[PDB]
A paper describes a structure:
The highly conserved [name] ([name], also known as variable flagellar number 3, [name]) is one of these understudied proteins. Here, we identify [name] as a highly conserved paralog of [name], a key organizer of the central scaffold around which centrioles are formed (Leidel et al., 2005). Our crystal structures of [name] demonstrate that it adopts a [name]-like fold and forms oligomers through two homodimerization domains in a similar way to [name]: an N-terminal globular head and a parallel coiled-coil domain. Further analysis of [name] reveals that its coiled-coil domains are capable of directly interacting with microtubules.
Residue numbers in the entry:
A (entry chain A), B (entry chain A): 6 to 96, 114 to 140
Write the structure that this text describes.
């Protein structure tokens, strides 16, 4: 597995990704408050997601983009973490949405991954 | 209108593009033989085309990418001109297919524009 510290809106978070076969496991944790948001996504779900943005990606390609954003080893992919306030403005209430932002010359695509609160 | 000389497989061609409202006009000409291939595409057709590749583009964005490839002012878009031999291998007989090749970090997309022989 891969585990990195990543800063979302000033707050360092612990992020864990697990890719095993055709399923993607993701965990975001605020260590100070012990808050955790976790999501499980299979290849079918991911491809439905990327297709809906009009910028399709294979599941294995999406997972690599996700890792490249996390390790900050790629210039076109980045991460953000949105609350429920950010989404209803864009369109419990403890859910978070990890956004994979794909920025290239003629595209800016947002791939949203919903992470229920734990 | 825009008119540039562009080399396809070693042969310099004359290319003319005309964007007027929501229709795209394209002409490729071999001056030595006076051969011309011309295509007319409306915004609806272009968007059906880009959507089918899984990498959607708005009509006005597609036209700009097309011009950037022609003037060679962009690092992600390039052109090629395919005959009917190249396509049946990939899958009258005088038709040509202008391919807009979109190359970014996690995508390589081919947008094919069919140009009937004149």
């Amino acid at each position: 597995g891969l585990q990195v510290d990543y800063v979302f809106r000033g707050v360092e978070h612990a992020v864990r990704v697990m890719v095993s076969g055709q399923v993607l496991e993701l965990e975001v944790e605020d260590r100070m408050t012990a808050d955790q948001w976790r999501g499980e996504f299979d290849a079918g779900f991911i491809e439905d997601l990327t297709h809906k943005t009009g910028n399709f990606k294979q599941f294995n390609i999406f997972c690599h983009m996700l890792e490249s954003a996390l390790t900050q080893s790629s210039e076109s992919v980045t991460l953000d973490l949105l609350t429920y306030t950010d989404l209803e403005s864009l369109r419990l209430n403890s859910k978070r949405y990890l956004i994979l932002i794909y920025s290239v010359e003629f595209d800016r695509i947002h791939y949203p991954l919903p992470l229920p609160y734990q």
